[PDB]
Short mmCIF file of C-alpha atoms in Angstrom, two decimals:
data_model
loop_
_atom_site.label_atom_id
_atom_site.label_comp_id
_atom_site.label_asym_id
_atom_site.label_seq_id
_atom_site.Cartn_x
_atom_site.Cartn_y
_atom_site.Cartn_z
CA UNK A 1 29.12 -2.09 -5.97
CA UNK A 2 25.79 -1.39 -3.97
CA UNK A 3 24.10 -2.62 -7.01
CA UNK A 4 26.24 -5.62 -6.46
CA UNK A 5 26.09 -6.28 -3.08
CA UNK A 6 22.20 -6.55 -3.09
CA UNK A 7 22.36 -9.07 -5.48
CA UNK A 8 25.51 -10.74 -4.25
CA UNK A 9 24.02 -12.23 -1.48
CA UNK B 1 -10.28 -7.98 -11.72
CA UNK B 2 -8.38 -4.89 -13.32
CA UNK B 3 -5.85 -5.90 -10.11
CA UNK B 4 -6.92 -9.19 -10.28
CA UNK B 5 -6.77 -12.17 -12.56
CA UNK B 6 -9.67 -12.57 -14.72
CA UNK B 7 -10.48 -16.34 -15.15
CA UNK B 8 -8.42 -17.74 -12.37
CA UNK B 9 -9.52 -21.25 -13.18
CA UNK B 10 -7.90 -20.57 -16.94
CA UNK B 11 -4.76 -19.37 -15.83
CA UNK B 12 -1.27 -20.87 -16.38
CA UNK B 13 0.47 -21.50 -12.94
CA UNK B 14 3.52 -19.12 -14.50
CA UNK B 15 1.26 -16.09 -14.55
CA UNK B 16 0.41 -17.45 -11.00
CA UNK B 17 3.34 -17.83 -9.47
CA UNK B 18 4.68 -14.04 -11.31
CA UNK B 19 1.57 -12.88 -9.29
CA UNK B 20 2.65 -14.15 -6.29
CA UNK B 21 5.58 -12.08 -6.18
CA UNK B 22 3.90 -8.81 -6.07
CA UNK B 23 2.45 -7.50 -3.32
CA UNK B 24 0.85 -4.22 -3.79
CA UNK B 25 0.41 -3.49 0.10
CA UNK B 26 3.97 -3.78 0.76
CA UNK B 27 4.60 -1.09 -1.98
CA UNK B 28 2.23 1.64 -0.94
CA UNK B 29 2.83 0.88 2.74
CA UNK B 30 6.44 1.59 2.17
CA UNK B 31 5.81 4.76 0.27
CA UNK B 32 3.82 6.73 2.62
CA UNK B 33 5.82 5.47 5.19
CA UNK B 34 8.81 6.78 3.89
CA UNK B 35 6.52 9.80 2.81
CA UNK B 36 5.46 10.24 6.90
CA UNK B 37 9.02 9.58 8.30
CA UNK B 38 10.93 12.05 5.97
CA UNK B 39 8.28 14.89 6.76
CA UNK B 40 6.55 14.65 10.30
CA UNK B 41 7.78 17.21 12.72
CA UNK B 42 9.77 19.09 9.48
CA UNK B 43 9.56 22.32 8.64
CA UNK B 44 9.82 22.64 4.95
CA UNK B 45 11.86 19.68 3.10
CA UNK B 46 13.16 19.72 -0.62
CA UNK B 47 10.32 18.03 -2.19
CA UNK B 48 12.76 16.57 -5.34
CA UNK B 49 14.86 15.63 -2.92
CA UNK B 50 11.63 13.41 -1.93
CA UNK B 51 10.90 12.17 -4.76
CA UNK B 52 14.45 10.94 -4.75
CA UNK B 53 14.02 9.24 -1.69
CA UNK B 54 11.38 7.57 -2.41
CA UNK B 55 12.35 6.43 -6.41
CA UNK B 56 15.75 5.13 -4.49
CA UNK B 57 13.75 2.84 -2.25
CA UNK B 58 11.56 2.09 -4.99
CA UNK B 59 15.22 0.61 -6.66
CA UNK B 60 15.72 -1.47 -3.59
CA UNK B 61 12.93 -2.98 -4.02
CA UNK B 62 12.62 -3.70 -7.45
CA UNK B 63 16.45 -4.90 -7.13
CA UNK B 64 14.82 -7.10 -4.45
CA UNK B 65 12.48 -8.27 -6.69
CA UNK B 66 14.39 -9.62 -9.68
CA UNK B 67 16.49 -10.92 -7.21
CA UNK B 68 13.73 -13.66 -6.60
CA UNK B 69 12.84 -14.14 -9.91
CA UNK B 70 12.51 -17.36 -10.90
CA UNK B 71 14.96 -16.56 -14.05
CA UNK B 72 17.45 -14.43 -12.43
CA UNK B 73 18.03 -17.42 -10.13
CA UNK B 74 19.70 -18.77 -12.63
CA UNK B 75 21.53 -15.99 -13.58
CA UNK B 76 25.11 -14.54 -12.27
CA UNK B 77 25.76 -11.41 -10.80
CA UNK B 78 27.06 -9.58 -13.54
CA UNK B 79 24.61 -10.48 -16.20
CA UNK B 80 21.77 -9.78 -13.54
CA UNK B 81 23.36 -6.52 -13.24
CA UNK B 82 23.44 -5.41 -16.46
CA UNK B 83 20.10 -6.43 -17.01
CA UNK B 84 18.60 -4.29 -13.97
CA UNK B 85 20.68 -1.29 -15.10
CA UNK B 86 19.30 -1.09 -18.44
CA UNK B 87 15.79 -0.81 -17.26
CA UNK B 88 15.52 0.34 -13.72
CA UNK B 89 13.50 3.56 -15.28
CA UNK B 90 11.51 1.57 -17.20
CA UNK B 91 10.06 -0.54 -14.74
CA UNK B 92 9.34 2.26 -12.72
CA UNK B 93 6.49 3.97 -14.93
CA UNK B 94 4.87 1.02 -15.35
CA UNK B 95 4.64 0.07 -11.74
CA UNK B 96 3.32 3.73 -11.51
CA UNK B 97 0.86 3.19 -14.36
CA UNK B 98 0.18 0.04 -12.73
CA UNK B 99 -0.91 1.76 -9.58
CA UNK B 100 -1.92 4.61 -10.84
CA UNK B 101 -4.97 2.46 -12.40
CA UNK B 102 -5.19 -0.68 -10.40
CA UNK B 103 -5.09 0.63 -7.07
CA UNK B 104 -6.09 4.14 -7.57
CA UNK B 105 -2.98 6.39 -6.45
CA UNK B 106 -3.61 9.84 -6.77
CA UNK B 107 -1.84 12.40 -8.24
CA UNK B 108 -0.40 14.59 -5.29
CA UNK B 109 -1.21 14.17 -1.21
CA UNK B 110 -1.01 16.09 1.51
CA UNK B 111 2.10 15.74 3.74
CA UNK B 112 0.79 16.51 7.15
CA UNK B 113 3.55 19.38 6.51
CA UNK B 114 0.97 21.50 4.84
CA UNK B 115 3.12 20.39 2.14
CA UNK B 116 1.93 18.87 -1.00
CA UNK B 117 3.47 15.92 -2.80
CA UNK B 118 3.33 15.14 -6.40
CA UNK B 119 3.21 11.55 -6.51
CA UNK B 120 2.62 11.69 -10.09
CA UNK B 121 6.39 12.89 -10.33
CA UNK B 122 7.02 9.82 -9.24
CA UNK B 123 5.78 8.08 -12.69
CA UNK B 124 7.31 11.03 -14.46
CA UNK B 125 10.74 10.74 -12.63
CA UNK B 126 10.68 14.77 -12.41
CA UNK B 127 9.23 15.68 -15.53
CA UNK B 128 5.99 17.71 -15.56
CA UNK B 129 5.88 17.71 -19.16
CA UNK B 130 5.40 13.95 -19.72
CA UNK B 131 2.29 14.20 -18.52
CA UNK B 132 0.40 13.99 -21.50
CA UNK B 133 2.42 11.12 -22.64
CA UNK B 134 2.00 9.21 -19.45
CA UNK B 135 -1.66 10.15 -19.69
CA UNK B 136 -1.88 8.70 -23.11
CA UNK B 137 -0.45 5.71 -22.39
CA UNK B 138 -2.69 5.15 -19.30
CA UNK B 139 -5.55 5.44 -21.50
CA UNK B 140 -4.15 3.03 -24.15
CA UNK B 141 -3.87 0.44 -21.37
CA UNK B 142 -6.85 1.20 -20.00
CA UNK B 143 -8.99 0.45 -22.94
CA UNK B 144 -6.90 -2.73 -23.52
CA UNK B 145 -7.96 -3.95 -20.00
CA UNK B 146 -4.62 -3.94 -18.43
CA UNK B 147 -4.49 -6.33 -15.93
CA UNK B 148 -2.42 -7.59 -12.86
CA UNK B 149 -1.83 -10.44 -14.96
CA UNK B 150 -0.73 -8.70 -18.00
CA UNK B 151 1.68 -6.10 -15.65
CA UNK B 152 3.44 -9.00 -14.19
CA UNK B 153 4.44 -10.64 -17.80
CA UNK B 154 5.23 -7.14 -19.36
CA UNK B 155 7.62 -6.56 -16.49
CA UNK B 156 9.62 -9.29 -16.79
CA UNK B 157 9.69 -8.45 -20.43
CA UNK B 158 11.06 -5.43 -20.11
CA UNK B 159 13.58 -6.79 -17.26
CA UNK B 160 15.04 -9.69 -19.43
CA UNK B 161 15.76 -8.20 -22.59
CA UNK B 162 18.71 -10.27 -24.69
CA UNK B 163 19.34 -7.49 -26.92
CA UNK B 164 21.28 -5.98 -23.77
CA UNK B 165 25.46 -4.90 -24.70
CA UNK B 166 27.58 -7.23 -22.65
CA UNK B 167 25.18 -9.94 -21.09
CA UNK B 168 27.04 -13.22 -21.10
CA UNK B 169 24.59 -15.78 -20.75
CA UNK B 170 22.55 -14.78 -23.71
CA UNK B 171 20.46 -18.10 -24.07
CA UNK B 172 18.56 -17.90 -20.53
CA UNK B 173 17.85 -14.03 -20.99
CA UNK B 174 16.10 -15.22 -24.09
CA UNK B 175 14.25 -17.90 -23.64
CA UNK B 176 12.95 -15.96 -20.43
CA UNK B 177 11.86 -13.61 -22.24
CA UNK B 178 10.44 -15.79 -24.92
CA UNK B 179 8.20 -17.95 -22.49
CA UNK B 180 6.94 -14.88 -21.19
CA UNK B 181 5.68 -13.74 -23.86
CA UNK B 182 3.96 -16.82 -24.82
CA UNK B 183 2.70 -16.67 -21.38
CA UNK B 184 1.24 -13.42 -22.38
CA UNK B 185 -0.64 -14.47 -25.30
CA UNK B 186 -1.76 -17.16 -24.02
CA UNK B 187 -3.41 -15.39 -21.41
CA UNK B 188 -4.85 -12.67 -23.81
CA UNK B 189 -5.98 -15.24 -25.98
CA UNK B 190 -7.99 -17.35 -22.86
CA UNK B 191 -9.08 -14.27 -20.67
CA UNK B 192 -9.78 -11.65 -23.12
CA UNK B 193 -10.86 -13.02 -26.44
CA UNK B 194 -13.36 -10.31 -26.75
CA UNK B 195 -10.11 -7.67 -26.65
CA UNK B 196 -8.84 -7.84 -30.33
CA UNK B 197 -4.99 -7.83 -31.10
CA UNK B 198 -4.47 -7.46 -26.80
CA UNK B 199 -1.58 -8.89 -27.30
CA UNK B 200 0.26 -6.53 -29.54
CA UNK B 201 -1.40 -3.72 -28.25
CA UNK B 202 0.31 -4.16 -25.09
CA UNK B 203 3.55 -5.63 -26.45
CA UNK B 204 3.57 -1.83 -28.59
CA UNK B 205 3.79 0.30 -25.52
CA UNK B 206 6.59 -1.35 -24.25
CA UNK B 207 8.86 0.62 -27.08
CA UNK B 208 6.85 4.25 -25.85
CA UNK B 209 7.41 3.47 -21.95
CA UNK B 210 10.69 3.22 -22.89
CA UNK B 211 11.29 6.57 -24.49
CA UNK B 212 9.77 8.27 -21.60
CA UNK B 213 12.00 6.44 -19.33
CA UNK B 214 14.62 8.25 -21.39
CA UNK B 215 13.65 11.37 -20.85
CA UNK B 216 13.34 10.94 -17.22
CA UNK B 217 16.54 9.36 -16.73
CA UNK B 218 17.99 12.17 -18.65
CA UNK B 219 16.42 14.92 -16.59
CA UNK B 220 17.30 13.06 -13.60
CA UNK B 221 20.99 12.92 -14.33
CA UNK B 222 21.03 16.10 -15.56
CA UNK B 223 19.64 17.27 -12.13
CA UNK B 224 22.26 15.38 -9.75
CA UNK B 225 24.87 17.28 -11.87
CA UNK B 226 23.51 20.62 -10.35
CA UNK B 227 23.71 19.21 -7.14
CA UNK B 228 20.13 18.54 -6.24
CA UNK B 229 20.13 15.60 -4.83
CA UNK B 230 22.67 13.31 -2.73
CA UNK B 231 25.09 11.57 -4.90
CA UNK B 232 26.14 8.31 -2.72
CA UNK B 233 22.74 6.84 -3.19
CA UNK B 234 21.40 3.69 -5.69
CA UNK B 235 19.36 5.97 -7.53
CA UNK B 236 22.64 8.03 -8.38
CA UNK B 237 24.37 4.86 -9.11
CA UNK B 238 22.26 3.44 -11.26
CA UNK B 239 21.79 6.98 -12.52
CA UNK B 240 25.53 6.61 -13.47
CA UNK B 241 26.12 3.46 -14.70
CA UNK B 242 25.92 4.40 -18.07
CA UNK B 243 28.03 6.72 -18.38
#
């Protein structure tokens, strides 16, 4: 979920 | 011209442009900084739990990284996830055997806490014992005149990798990964024609980076389950992820 936000935006 | 590109004017714009997305200063800057602001004015500090620190920043960045990536861009979340997760360690040790020759890091430095730091943990990801391995690999590199150019094109070969469980859009990892390599023989075969079989030579260590990123991930893992080192970080999550 970190991992995702960095790359979500 | 070890950190540098060796025939400029006989270099595709690809390898160029891969270049441009590295910037060396920014990455050593950031570590002693981190290094200064996490020991100044501190008594005695849990040097693994440094070396965490600074390997979970080094994640941010490399996240921050493929992020830009000219491929990624055209990649969704998910699959770009997957694809980071796989080989977060193994980017690591190369960037450390990339600075570790090209722009002469040293093995330990003193913290201004009268403590010492083992940067070279940092390549090892907490285990002594690789040493040798790392060492040997360093030399094999060395000898094939491991360049910036060839660091940049190996790194992006190790980050797109099809053969990775659950990627969706297969085609793009592949053909990524494909013109990169191309990229990188090309570049072999124009700047170091003197350097027999560069090519595979480098391509082979790719396969031995990879089982000391193993171990290192392992030992790591193993050593958040004591305890050792904070759990809601990157590092841990990506730590996790497969598991």
């Amino acid at each position: 979920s970190t991992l995702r936000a960095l790359l979500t935006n | 011209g070890s950190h540098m590109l060796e025939d400029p004017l006989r270099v595709s714009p690809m390898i160029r442009e891969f270049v441009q997305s590295i910037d060396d200063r920014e990455w050593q800057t950031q570590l002693f900084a981190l290094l200064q602001k996490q020991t100044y004015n501190q008594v005695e500090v849990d040097l693994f739990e440094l070396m965490c620190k600074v390997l979970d920043q080094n994640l941010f960045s490399q996240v921050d990284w493929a992020r830009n990536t000219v491929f990624f861009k055209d990649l969704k979340v998910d699959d770009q996830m997957k694809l980071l997760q796989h080989s977060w360690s193994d980017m690591l040790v190369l960037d450390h055997l990339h600075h570790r020759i090209h722009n002469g890091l040293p093995d330990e430095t003193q913290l201004n806490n009268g403590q010492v730091f083992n940067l070279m943990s940092l390549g090892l990801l907490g285990v002594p014992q690789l040493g040798d391995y790392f060492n040997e690999l360093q030399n094999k590199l060395q000898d094939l005149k491991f360049d910036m150019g060839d660091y940049v094109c190996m790194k992006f070969l190790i980050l797109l990798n099809p053969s990775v469980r659950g990627i969706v859009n297969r085609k793009t990892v592949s053909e990524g990964h494909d013109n990169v390599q191309a990229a990188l023989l090309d570049y072999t075969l124009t700047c170091y024609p003197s350097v027999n079989d560069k090519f595979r030579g480098l391509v082979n260590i790719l396969p031995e980076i990879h089982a000391m990123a193993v171990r290192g991930e392992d030992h790591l893992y193993t050593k958040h389950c004591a305890g050792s080192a904070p759990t809601q970080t990157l590092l841990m999550e990506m730590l996790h992820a497969k598991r």
